[PDB]
């Protein structure tokens, strides 16, 4: 009885690895080129009916919280936003001494001081001539420098860029695909809580289309759960960690900006044009969002039931509005039709639940100069959009934070807060992981090489 090693190539074995993933995008958007911030024109087309093939008898451990392909997706969006703004106007001559007065074009009692009508001097096509021009700015984008003289909010720190009026912030799905020699394993387990073995796992050519939606509280337009509402958290007992909630049935939110805004062109200088806001046609009204009271209440009823599993059958669950802080975390921030909304969600998160037709109108505010989440420094300026904006979206989950309280309280209070944008896509990449294929396994057999 003698035994010798044998070499087998093309052997199925893998190991968790770190690598660079490239993009694949559907060709449905190839026609009507335009331009996107995510630049899917260079993104290679995907293969129709990709090889989604099941793997039997295989147990694989996942961990969405230390997962790769989320840190490097974070960088991709940051870098993809940078090269979009590089070739666009630099509004360095825009902030000077303005002379603003309130807008009184039949305004409503809600929109009292929220709009300012400003006039300023700007260079003509010739550098030897100035001329007076005017534009409408929101109250959140100006400060007094006393009087009735103002300046733009964010040019004593940095300078803003004008998003070229062709780039389209509208997200489109993106498939993250691994190179040859690497594979992506997708967890098909229904009751997957983000950690531990996934007895139902498969390997796919690459991920489903993931639309990158930047949003705080109430992450939108995402993937829905399968049969129940899933509460996933890195550590439940730690109050400092967020709680990512994903519920199966979506609840519709209708957000509109009723004002019939108009767009005006102001010449910064030779070859430079600034897109301003001309006189508003019609009436003035606060922007708002709408959700059903019935649909929202039943969804919260499902979330509370699931929250009792990790917190106790006999426990009081309480919802309260945001704690307080920066405007981009105390409100539902999102982008709708090229404009940036900041919605007051106090009407959604206010309830108490004991263990034993109409809609919700939540008001919103608008900004033109935004401090970009990509960096603490550079901002950007969103040009006004012609007409009236209206977008319908799915709320597919929540981002919650539990208030810290002493033991024996018997009342757990949760607050909404989005903050980190890594959570927005960690809710979409919880299924996936990357491994490297490792052929050339050596085993013994009853065979000897010929001499």
């Amino acid at each position, epitope marked *: 009885e003698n035994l010798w090693v044998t070499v087998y190539y093309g052997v199925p074995v893998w190991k968790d690895a770190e690598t660079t993933l490239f993009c694949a995008s559907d060709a449905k958007a190839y026609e009507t080129e335009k331009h996107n911030v995510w630049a899917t024109h260079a993104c290679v087309p995907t293969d129709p009916n990709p090889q989604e093939i099941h793997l039997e008898n295989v147990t694989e451990e996942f961990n969405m919280w230390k997962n790769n392909m989320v840190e490097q997706m974070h960088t991709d969006i940051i870098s993809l936003w940078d090269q979009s703004l590089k070739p666009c106007v630099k509004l360095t001559p825009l902030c000077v001494t303005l002379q603003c007065t309130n807008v009184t074009n039949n305004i409503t009692d809600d929109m009292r001081g929220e709009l300012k009508n400003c006039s300023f001097n700007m260079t003509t096509e010739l550098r030897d001539k100035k001329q007076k021009v005017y534009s409408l700015f929101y109250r959140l984008d100006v400060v007094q420098i006393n009087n009735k003289e103002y300046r733009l909010i964010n040019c004593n*720190t940095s300078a803003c860029t004008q998003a070229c009026p062709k780039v389209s912030f509208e997200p489109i799905p993106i498939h993250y695909c691994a190179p040859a020699g690497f594979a992506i394993l997708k967890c098909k387990d229904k009751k997957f809580n983000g950690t531990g073995p996934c007895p139902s796992v498969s390997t796919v050519q690459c991920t489903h289309g993931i639309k990158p939606v930047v949003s705080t509280q109430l992450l939108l337009n995402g993937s829905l759960a399968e049969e129940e509402v899933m509460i996933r958290s890195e550590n439940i007992t730690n*109050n*400092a960690k*967020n709680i990512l909630v994903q519920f199966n049935t979506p609840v519709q939110i209708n957000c509109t900006r009723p004002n019939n805004n108009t767009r005006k062109s102001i010449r910064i200088g030779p070859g430079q044009a600034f897109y301003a806001t001309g006189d508003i046609i019609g009436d003035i009204r606060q922007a708002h969002c709408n959700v059903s009271k019935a649909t929202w209440n039943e969804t919260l009823g499902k979330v509370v039931k699931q929250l009792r599993k990790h917190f106790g059958n006999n426990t009081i669950i309480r919802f309260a509005n945001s*704690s*307080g*802080g*920066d405007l*981009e*975390v105390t409100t539902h921030s999102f982008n709708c039709g090229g404009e940036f909304f900041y919605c007051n969600t106090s009407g959604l998160f206010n309830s108490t639940w004991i263990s034993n037709n109409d809609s919700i109108t939540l008001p919103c505010r608008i900004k033109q100069i935004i*401090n970009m*989440w990509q*960096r*603490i*420094g550079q*901002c950007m300026y969103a040009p006004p959009i012609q007409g009236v904006i209206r977008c319908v979206s799915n709320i597919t989950g929540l981002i919650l*934070t*539990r*208030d*810290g309280g002493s033991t024996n309280s018997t009342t757990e209070t949760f*607050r909404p*807060g989005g*903050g*980190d*944008m890594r959570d927005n896509w960690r809710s979409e990449l919880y299924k996936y992981k990357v491994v490297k294929i490792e052929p050339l396994g050596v085993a013994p057999t009853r065979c000897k090489r010929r001499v």
Partner: nanobody, 118 residues
């Protein structure tokens, strides 16, 4: 490895002046916001001041304290002025999970060792 190192060490009397410093080592400075928290003896953590792209101050500040960040040295500096006796507490430095500043302690994942200012 992310770590925060504090300074200041306040031993000044009433109506004093200090400058607490907090250096961020194992992470990008222009990716997160940093805020100062305070713990009087026998009490809970409270928000003092923080700044990412915009500064925020606590209610008890009343415009006495002032925060600033020098991205060159990756530090956040907290000016202290008109220190009343009730400021005696342990001033902590924390890094936010994002670029935005909250008033609750759930918005920060890394904390400083602490500085007892009396």
């Amino acid at each position: 490895e992310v770590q925060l190192v504090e300074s200041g060490g306040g031993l000044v009397q009433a109506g004093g002046f200090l400058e607490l410093s907090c250096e961020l080592r194992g992470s990008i400075f222009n990716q997160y916001a940093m805020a100062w928290f305070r713990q009087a003896p026998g009490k809970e953590r409270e928000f003092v001041a923080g700044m990412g792209a915009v500064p925020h101050y606590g209610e008890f500040v009343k415009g006495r304290f002032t925060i600033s960040r020098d991205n060159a040295k990756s530090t956040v500096y907290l000016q202290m002025s008109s220190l009343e006796p009730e400021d005696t507490a342990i001033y902590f430095c924390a890094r936010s999970k994002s670029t935005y500043i909250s008033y609750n302690s759930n918005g920060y994942d890394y904390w400083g060792q602490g500085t007892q200012v009396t």
